[PDB]
Design a protein around this ligand. Structure first.
Ligand SMILES: O=P(O)(O)O[C@@H]1[C@@H](OP(=O)(O)O)[C@H](OP(=O)(O)OP(=O)(O)O)[C@H](OP(=O)(O)O)[C@H](OP(=O)(O)OP(=O)(O)O)[C@@H]1OP(=O)(O)O
Ligand SMILES: O=P(O)(O)O[C@@H]1[C@@H](OP(=O)(O)O)[C@H](OP(=O)(O)OP(=O)(O)O)[C@H](OP(=O)(O)O)[C@H](OP(=O)(O)OP(=O)(O)O)[C@@H]1OP(=O)(O)O
Ligand SMILES: O=P(O)(O)O[C@H]1[C@@H](OP(=O)(O)O)[C@H](OP(=O)(O)OP(=O)(O)O)[C@@H](OP(=O)(O)O)[C@H](OP(=O)(O)OP(=O)(O)O)[C@@H]1OP(=O)(O)O
Ligand SMILES: O=P(O)(O)O[C@H]1[C@@H](OP(=O)(O)O)[C@H](OP(=O)(O)OP(=O)(O)O)[C@@H](OP(=O)(O)O)[C@H](OP(=O)(O)OP(=O)(O)O)[C@@H]1OP(=O)(O)O
Lengths: 590, 590
């Protein structure tokens, strides 16, 4: 009932302030078990044990409450100190109208993001009180006394965290001020923006969505079995399937990315590392994991069906080079669907992000656009494809005949588009912050992947012609390979993940604190990301030299290191947004 | 928020006693809209309108509360009157031990079924109070006054339904009496049987189960598309598919039965007609609709795959006459799985039911075994199959050759096994109750389906030989056809469904009350069950004369009338278990 209820309804950034139910329960249960004797020893000696612990208990309760109200009052002062500046800012603004649209618009994200601190603090008044009357009721049950219940009336509801009705009156003035100065009355349009819906792991998946995740993962399994059958029967021929996989690798890397990003969003929501505060999403509406599994499953059904139509060749009139085109025209029409349907706010946010990353020297660099520029250094085969598959229909495809599928620059550069993106983003972080370690470095990390592709291509072109200036360039590519491997594997474990810290202490080789449940995950991953970081630099070289057989088998694997890396790049982030207790974004009105 | 919360957490049998939130809200909203004028008319005249309604409101509130405590106290007295007899019964029992196992066992279903009346009445104290402070808070919000909030302290929490702390002390004595005299202490094994889990429409489907319902309905859709393809391609031949469908019709009628029974359980749970009190299930643990959709989907995957293995003929060693056998050996092994896994209590209850119906002159006739003896008068083709498919492997199958499928009594009687079952059950109802209308009649209903099969078979056998005694028997089958059609279509609308009642009133041609939301469902069904009750008597005759082409197309359709009939046979039941307010079973200890 509660221990779970409390370990779920808790605000992650504050976990070191709640009642610590588990320790209490364990203390009580251990105490009862280590009872001296039922009647074997003397009577009053049994009392001692059932006394000494009683003294210990109410003592640790005392310091326990002492934490709450101290933490509580401190948090409250913050709110008070907020409703101060957050109000005069409106005051100045109000008269100023006689960018104002913008100024008004950002202001409502100040209050809406204020009224989420309070109503996340109000919970802290209840989630403790009715987490303070439960634990006591076992103490009065286990020992079968009443001292606990009495102490509950002796200290708890006299203490300034349950009998301090200040937060509620703050809630009342914010909702009459927002109502009055933001929505021209119309309280209904104000308590639609302000209301906070039960968030965290406390929102179950809307049954229909778990169903649809069941369906699109259902059609998908049979479609995969049908592919594995038919590619071991129907396809059989003398025709080259290398165009077929060289075109159906893009969709696959992009499906294996969204299933894994779904598992990422779940492994974040459950383990407490909030992927809401960091990305700057709005904490009332999100995409829980199920929606990601569902989008991934859907695009997976589309991918499977296009492949099957290519192999089974279902209708004679449509040549065969139209199924891949239809599939990839849908996988990108779904993303620019200009209605307000099928994840409208979602795709619109993602599009704003892409536009602030695919042209990102100019715009600021948040965390969303520093993250989805390290999801493009792994799906970097979906770009050499959307180069190959675009050159191929243009200059190689035979439009005279219905049988289709069964393309000096472009590859070398297009392989380093995302590395260039991130190099520029880090230079921009520098040119604003004025701090080198860590912005100028962490811009080298990508300068190397420039001095790998270039030198590998030089060796390639000078071995194709087979000239004297070839072995020299190869000695250069091989000496820059170890560079662009270590200088990105040390950075993958020291500053991103944050592991290997002197404050490690008990956590052998790890960080001082670890958010994720077990202690073998970190070691498994610290081995994996070491293996799979050498077969991504090769994977870069080979698919740039003068190959696809190793590409289509290392591409689906790189995305796995990106998945196992998201866990820790978001942990090591949250657990730097935890030491300062920050449950709500600081929004700025200008 | 509440109107729904209240229209869901409500105890169906008591719906005519709750606060009637919707009428209140509508009254308030209409009142505010029909306000005389904002300032157009005179000031104090606006007061009149905002006064007259104020007087009206508190008046209808007054009679509203007057209903609750009167209903409440009356319900409480019942509980008190219970804890009386329900206790001395234990008292007498206690000393008697010095069938006792049985006597003890039935006694715990007396308390567990008692402590569900209280904790369904306790809710009635909260679900009203915090349904009495909401409605008022809109009245004080809409009119923007405080009279409502004051009246709340003037009448509500002085009234003997919120300040009557008697039910809770009853809960305390029942759980210390059960703890002490049923479980030898061991409070943990008593508050495992007594606890009531949030029931009704208030229990969401356990996410994993909605997922699995998504999966087994996912593999199923592609498997059906593959069947429709392959039976329009792979099967093609000169071999007779009549054995193939004459064997794969059983599984289909049994799948189309469980999907539809799932839709039945949902249409019951949602529309309020409880399928829990009537079947005598235990109200804490049930099978919500999702579990039925999931079992149906699973047996559907098995059916589809067996069919596909028959058509695709996947492995050469296993002849082809082994796939239907494997499918139907699994569909019946799933039902006698002697572990405690895969719906253990469920299948064990269903098996106890079958054993109390397939031999049912002797056992009592509850409602479960009167209901699942009218689910066997529709799945009556699954018996002429398990006759045909059993005779065929025995005396027709060619075990010498691997190619298999591509069998004077038995049919005539086996068609009337379930009609015989129900005829006997009604005779047993008579031989106990001693009442004819409705037991002796409603035993005729099945005597006719005896004088239809018999006479149709007589005409058949005398036309095969083609003798003089043929046209006479046909004039008899045709005169008993209209009998066995009208005498079961009038009974399908007058006593089962209960429709066409003189107390109809406003509900044209219907019953006085209707539990189901709309008013076109009843007419649609009253037309349907008229059409599909003539093509079930034919369907009986044809598949008994000397055919399958019309059988395999009317069998999947009869089950539809059984589905559309379950709705109303359970409505017309619940809405006779509602007039007496009975939310808990009366269990008897002997
Ligand atoms: O909050 P965002 O930015 O994520 O999205 C909302 C915001 O968009 P935007 O500011 O234009 O980027 C407003 O748009 P807008 O043009 O109407 O007005 P402004 O541009 O804000 O002046 C808002 O209206 P409003 O609340 O300001 O009146 C609402 O409009 P719409 O859908 O038509 O819904 P209604 O408002 O008509 O019900 C938008 O969507 P939703 O929130 O889902 O409804
Ligand atoms: O209540 P039912 O009839 O629907 O089912 C229970 C009841 O069955 P039955 O009376 O035999 O028909 C008891 O069986 P039983 O033989 O143990 O004892 P009795 O025959 O009742 O004397 C009960 O144990 P118990 O609670 O009485 O000790 C429990 O057994 P089991 O798991 O071994 O129980 P635990 O060891 O986990 O308690 C059965 O299932 P569950 O309730 O799901 O567990
Ligand atoms: O009577 P029992 O022994 O069968 O059950 C206990 C009962 O409290 P009771 O006995 O009435 O005082 C539950 O509260 P309840 O629903 O009555 O609610 P109210 O308090 O009455 O509102 C309580 O949940 P909780 O809500 O306090 O957390 C539960 O804790 P459980 O979830 O198992 O474990 P935790 O998560 O608590 O550690 C207790 O079981 P045990 O832990 O074994 O003692
Ligand atoms: O602030 P607003 O005006 O946007 O919203 C109102 C708000 O009460 P508030 O304003 O504080 O007085 C809700 O209660 P809440 O969460 O505050 O709960 P507390 O009681 O405060 O704990 C109330 O639900 P609820 O009162 O039935 O639980 C809701 O009615 P709606 O959902 O339609 O539910 P019904 O009308 O169908 O019942 C009201 O909206 P409108 O009906 O449009 O006026």
């Amino acid at each position: 009932k509660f221990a779970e209820h409390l370990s779920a309804h808790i605000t992650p950034e504050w976990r070191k302030q709640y009642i610590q139910y588990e320790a209490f329960k364990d203390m009580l249960y251990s105490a009862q078990d280590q009872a001296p004797s039922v009647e074997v020893t003397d009577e009053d000696t049994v009392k001692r044990y059932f006394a000494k612990f009683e003294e210990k208990f109410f003592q640790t309760c005392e310091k326990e409450l002492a934490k709450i109200n101290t933490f509580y009052s401190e948090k409250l002062a913050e709110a008070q100190r907020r409703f101060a500046t957050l109000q005069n800012e409106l005051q100045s603004s109000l008269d100023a109208q006689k960018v104002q649209h913008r100024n008004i618009k950002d202001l409502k994200l100040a209050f809406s993001e204020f009224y989420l601190s309070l109503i996340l603090l109000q919970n802290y008044q209840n989630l403790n009180f009715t987490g303070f009357r439960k634990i006591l009721k076992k103490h009065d049950k286990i020992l079968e006394t009443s001292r606990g219940a009495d102490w509950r009336v002796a200290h708890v509801e006299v203490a300034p965290f349950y009998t301090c009705k200040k937060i509620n009156q703050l809630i009342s003035e914010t909702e009459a001020v927002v109502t009055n100065e933001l929505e021209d009355g119309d309280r209904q349009k104000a308590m639609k923006r302000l209301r906070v819906p039960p968030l965290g792991a406390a929102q179950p998946a809307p049954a229909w969505t778990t169903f649809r995740v069941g369906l699109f993962c259902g059609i998908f399994i049979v479609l995969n079995i049908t592919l594995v059958l038919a590619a071991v029967f129907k396809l059989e021929t003398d025709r080259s399937i290398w165009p077929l996989i060289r075109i159906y690798r893009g969709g696959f890397l992009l499906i294996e990315f969204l299933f894994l990003l779904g598992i990422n969003t779940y492994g974040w929501r459950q383990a407490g590392v909030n992927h809401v505060l960091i990305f700057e999403l709005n904490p009332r509406s999100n995409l829980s994991h199920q929606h990601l599994f569902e989008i991934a499953g859907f695009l997976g059904i589309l991918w499977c069906l296009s492949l099957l139509a290519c192999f089974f060749a279902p209708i004679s009139v449509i040549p065969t080079y139209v199924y891949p085109l239809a599939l990839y025209g849908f996988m990108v029409f779904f993303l620019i669907n200009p209605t307000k349907t099928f994840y409208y706010k979602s795709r619109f946010w993602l599009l704003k992000l892409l536009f602030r990353v695919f042209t990102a020297p100019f715009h600021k660099v948040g965390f969303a656009d520093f993250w989805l520029a390290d999801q493009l250094n792994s799906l970097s085969v979906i770009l050499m494809d959307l180069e190959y598959m675009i050159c191929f229909y243009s200059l190689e495809l035979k439009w005279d005949e219905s049988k289709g599928l069964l393309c000096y620059g472009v590859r070398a550069i297009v392989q380093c588009i995302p590395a260039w993106l991130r190099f520029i983003q880090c230079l921009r972080r520098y040119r604003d912050t004025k701090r080198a370690f860590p912005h100028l470095v962490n811009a080298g990390k990508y300068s190397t992947t420039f001095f790998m592709v270039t030198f590998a291509a030089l060796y390639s072109t000078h071995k194709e012609r087979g000239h004297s200036d070839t072995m020299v360039f190869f000695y250069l590519w091989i000496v820059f390979y170890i560079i662009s491997s270590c200088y990105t594997l040390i950075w993958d474990l020291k500053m991103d993940w944050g592991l290997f810290d002197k404050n490690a202490g008990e956590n052998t080789f790890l960080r001082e604190e670890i958010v994720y449940p077990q202690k073998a995950y970190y070691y498994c991953a610290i081995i994996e990301d070491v293996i799979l970081r050498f077969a991504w630099t090769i994977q870069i070289s080979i698919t740039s030299t003068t190959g696809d057989i190793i590409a289509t088998v290392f591409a689906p694997l790189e995305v796995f290191r990106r998945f196992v890396w998201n866990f820790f790049r978001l942990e090591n982030e949250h657990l730097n947004n935890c030491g300062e207790f920050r449950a709500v974004r600081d929004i700025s009105v200008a």
